[PDB]
From a paper:
To stabilise the 1:2 complex, we again used the Leucine zippered ectodomain (TpoR1-482-LeuZ). This site on each chain interacts with opposite sides of the cytokine (site I and site II). In one receptor chain, a large insertion, unique to [name], forms a partially structured loop that contacts cytokine. Despite the poor resolution, it appears that D4 contributes to homodimerization through a D4:D4 interface with an estimated buried surface area of approximately 110 Å2 per chain (PISA41).
[name] (Tpo) is a hematopoietic cytokine that is essential for the maintenance of hematopoietic stem cells and the regulation of megakaryocyte and platelet production. [name] is unusual in that it has tandem CHR domains.
Residue numbers in the entry:
A (entry chain B): 27 to 475
B (entry chain C): 23 to 174
C (entry chain A): 26 to 200, 228 to 475
The structure:
């Protein structure tokens, strides 16, 4: 309720919501018959005039009297307004106040709040339409959020919203009747809609809250205050709660994705009994305030040549890539009872995901028990800068010797007991600053000695 | 402390609302000349004289221009019978009454005198005169001189 | 370009104004005529008509045009309707009629007295201009085009809008009203040409783009990495920098620092003189220069060096900017080692300068007796030396280097420690 928030520390309180309307009220514990009160008003240099008062019973605070000012010309922002409350028969000014309407604004909370999981696990994209569009240029905004499973917690975690490269408090959001083919982050910019001749559109705002823990439901609330530069006022009431279910971090299913050739990306994730899953992907150039449309996704294609190997624990999938932008990925799992869940993978550049295949491990003994290590020359564009890693142990042993040479280095060298049995294994990552590839799968172990 | 007119978003809002209100005149069924003409302010000015007039004189003249526009608009509303056109003229009176208060919040109350006047008869002149005054002397004053007026 | 060709537009009896205290109207005709045949009459609303003194010019391969500029004898009022009639005097017939608002036509002149310089960091272009007619200077928007002077013609010149930001100021007072703006992303070391033009802002005054200015050549300084500039600071109070020498040349360096990225001044940047080392004690060959000056920890540092040839020409080079914590020249570490067994040793550090040593990024290498095959390690941020292995009691030696990469600081690579025989 709005009336509660306007009372403050004054005997007589008014508030304007659109800055072209006005209502004023005062409270007393007692009650009186009709005609016993008048809320006289006048702006500087006028004959006094009467507000069309009406009365309302509120036993919580006795009796409350309310008037609504004629919106035509009786509300003026920057001129001083005199207010007199008196019993007409007794004719004594019980309450007197002088008010500038620009200083008591109570803005309505945004309507048609829509929200969805953002670009990353824990991102929360909010899109809202502002009531009273003509004043939305002059408003601050505040957000609450808290988990559904924390009724005991006095933790709204209020946060204030302000303009950044990733937050847009106000935008002339594009289209009443959009089509999904529209490029991301399109808005009329300097070509603001010139009324109903182009599309007269919601004049809303949308931006991402960050840092939430993923994979569970949140309730959300939004409110506003005039920023006080030229229009001043107090915080308005909150909007009605809306609930958003964030996707979980794909790390919980062991999602791994990579490319071996800079043109095709392979993804894999685990599975559960009585469950099935499918994969998705997308690309986007830059972070910017999203449009209202839900993110587009494209299906991934299964690896299986029908091999019969049956590694039943994992699903593996592939799709052709591009290197113009960061890549996003998504995975959904379906239960036996038909329910579905969503998991969102961490974004990466393609060059941060290059998993060059297992290396051409090569070795040559300088002497019995001392050998150099190297690689059979191939894939020089990547092999020349990748970060090899290796381990080795003796016959039947489980004690590990380890080596990690410099970026793009040869296999280096190793030592061992002369003519004693040994074996080694290696893996690599494209860590040379030309690329940023992740750990590739280990090569097969080889009894190099 | 800081005057309300010194926020540029306020002037931009005034301009957008004025141009929206002017365009809306095309929608309602018909417009006919006012039976008795209406007095509108002196919006015309030359850049040659503007660069030499004293700042106090500019403020004193622009306040009177807005006041005379308001007086004309109120006379027009008094003359016209209840109809859509009268509602549009009321809503424009709202724009002019906002503009006058915004200007008084910065320039202070200073004794205005009338300039030259044109007794218009086309009701479109009031929207046009408001838009011309807003684009002209108002924004001229608030941009050329503004930063020196707004501090204290 | 020429103003008449931009004015020509799409309507008979064209008009234009460059300062909104002037007015020119003209029209082109297919066939010539004797003198006195036509007259240009004009009248601001609510005034009796008067005449404009015309004159004529031939049009290249198109005919002849009649032109008048409104005489200075009367004032030009902007937001005030103006009627234009051109009369055939022999017939007293109006040939073209137009209704004009002086604020509705405009071709603002390009800014005169352009000057430009190398910016604060490589690839930056500083731009400074003085308004050609200062009264309207705030009611204008500008756009900028630039291209390389070699005419390599990979592409036509790019154009950007000069919108007001923290860095670019379309309007400023200067000790004469004008503006300044900073443009970035240009290719360093190569010379550029520069052009500017402006249009009325479309809110108060309305019109279109005026003519481009004359091209001004700007010699952007090169990125100093091409001459091997490297600067470092052992401690916050002093900065040392060095750059590669050239045989037939002499050179000197200078420095500057700032807290902010405001619109730049008219006057050239005031560098502070860096001071050289003792040369003869330092290096008789002097294959690479060196310089030092006192520093601070409150600001970003910019450094510029210049070189002169034996022929006498001069070239300038601009170094990359850095925060002081990105430039910490931590000295060589106190490398420490201890064998857990013969041929297997842990590595650590002799405790000192913990305020920096506790988070720095160590790096090391080692090899055996008479060998040139390098073993390497790279542990985590602030880590101890870790461990290494070797043949029992065999000869080995090691060396290390470090950078202050722990997010408490952002320092660059320091010089290597001396190689030391640990086995
Ligand atoms: C972006 O990704 C594409 C592929 O997704 C990369 O294209 C690759 O470019 C290299 C170098 O040009 C190609 O190698 C060359 O192949 C030709 C035969 O087509 C051969 O004659 C050359 O000697 C050389 O080996 C490679 O084939 C090509 N890959 C594909 C799948 O077309 C591209 O380099 C990446 N970056 C950019 C900036 O495009
Ligand atoms: C900006 O740089 C100055 C140096 O130019 C920093 O001054 C540093 O101030 C601290 C105390 O505030 C000094 O710490 C002292 O160090 C001695 C050993 O040198 C120790 O025995 C004392 O107990 C005390 O811890 C420090 O020496 C001094 N210089 C350096 C290089 O750290 C100043 O701190 C810097 N700015 C800020 C905001 O820290
Ligand atoms: C009402 O109160 C006013 C203010 O005190 C007083 O001047 C006036 O005489 C009273 N009576 C009437 C009838 O106005
Ligand atoms: C109860 O409080 C705990 C904090 O100790 C919180 O983690 C939990 O979600 C709350 N549960 C409910 C139902 O309020
Ligand atoms: C030309 O004709 C107009 C009427 O169309 C008339 O008013 C005007 O006086 C004539 N010109 C002269 C020089 O008399
Ligand atoms: C080619 O160079 C000339 C200057 O010699 C220039 O006028 C022209 O625009 C250039 N064309 C392209 C496509 O760069
Ligand atoms: C490769 O894999 C390891 C885990 O085995 C990661 O911790 C490391 O960051 C890299 O991605
Ligand atoms: C230290 O020095 C190396 C070159 O030897 C750089 O590539 C590295 O980025 C760091 O600045």
């Amino acid at each position: 309720d709005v009336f509660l928030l306007a009372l403050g520390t004054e005997p007589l309180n008014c508030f304007s919501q659109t800055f072209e309307d006005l209502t004023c009220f005062w409270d007393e514990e007692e009650a009186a018959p009709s005609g016993t009160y008048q809320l006289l008003y006048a702006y500087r240099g006028e004959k006094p005039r009467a507000c069309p008062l009406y009365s309302q019973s509120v036993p919580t605070f006795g009796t409350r009297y309310v008037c609504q000012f004629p919106a035509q010309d009786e509300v003026r922002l920057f001129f001083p307004l005199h207010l007199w409350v008196k019993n007409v028969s007794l004719n004594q000014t019980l309450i007197q106040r002088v008010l500038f309407v620009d200083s008591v604004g109570l803005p309505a909370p945004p309507r048609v709040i829509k929200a969805r999981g953002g670009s990353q696990p824990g991102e929360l994209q909010i899109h809202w339409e502002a009531p009273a569009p003509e004043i939305s240029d002059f408003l601050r905004h505040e957000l609450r959020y808290g988990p559904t499973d924390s009724s005991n917690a006095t933790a709204p975690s209020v946060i204030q919203l302000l303009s950044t490269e990733t937050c847009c408090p106000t935008l002339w959001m594009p289209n009443p009747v959009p089509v999904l083919d529209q490029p991301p982050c399109v808005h009329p910019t300097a070509s603001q809609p010139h009324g109903p001749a182009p599309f007269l559109t919601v004049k809303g705002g949308s931006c991402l809250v960050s840092g939430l823990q993923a994979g569970k439901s949140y309730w959300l609330q939004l409110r506003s205050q005039p920023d006080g530069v030229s229009l001043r006022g107090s915080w308005g009431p909150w909007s009605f709660p809306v609930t958003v279910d964030l996707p979980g971090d794909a790390v919980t299913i062991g999602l791994q994705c990579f490319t071996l050739d800079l043109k095709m990306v392979t993804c894999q994730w685990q599975q559960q009994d009585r469950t099935s899953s499918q994969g998705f992907f997308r690309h986007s150039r830059t972070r910017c305030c999203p449009t209202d449309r839900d993110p587009t996704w494209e299906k991934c294609e299964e690896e299986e040549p029908r091999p019969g190997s049956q590694p039943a624990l994992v699903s593996r999938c592939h799709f052709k890539s591009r290197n113009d932008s960061v890549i996003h990925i998504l995975v959904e799992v379906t239960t036996a009872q038909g329910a579905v869940h969503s998991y969102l993978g961490s974004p990466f550049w393609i060059h941060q995901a290059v998993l060059l295949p297992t290396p051409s491990l090569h070795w040559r003994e300088v002497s019995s028990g001392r050998l150099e290590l190297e690689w059979q020359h191939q894939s020089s564009w990547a092999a020349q800068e990748t970060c090899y890693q290796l381990r080795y142990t003796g016959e039947g042993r489980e004690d590990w010797k380890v080596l990690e040479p410099s970026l793009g280095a040869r296999g280096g060298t190793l030592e061992l007991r002369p003519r004693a049995r040994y074996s080694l294994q290696l893996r690599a990552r494209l860590n040379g600053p030309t690329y940023q590839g992740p750990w590739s799968a280990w090569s097969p172990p080889a009894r190099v000695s | 402390p800081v005057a309300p007119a010194c926020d540029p978003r306020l002037l931009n809002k005034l301009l957008r609302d004025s141009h929206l209100l002017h365009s809306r005149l095309s929608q309602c069924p018909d417009v006919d000349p006012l039976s008795i003409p209406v007095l509108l302010p002196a919006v015309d000015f030359s850049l040659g004289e503007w660069k030499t007039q004293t700042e106090q004189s500019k403020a004193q003249d622009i306040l009177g221009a807005v006041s005379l526009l308001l007086e004309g608009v109120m006379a027009a509303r008094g003359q016209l019978e209840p109809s859509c056109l009268s509602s549009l003229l009321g809503q424009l009176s709202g724009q002019v009454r906002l503009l006058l208060g915004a200007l008084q919040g910065l320039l202070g109350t200073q004794l205005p005198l009338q300039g030259r006047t044109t007794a218009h008869k086309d009701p479109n002149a009031l929207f046009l005169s408001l838009q011309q005054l807003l684009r002209g002397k108002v924004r001229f004053l608030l941009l050329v001189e503004g930063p020196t007026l707004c501090v204290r």
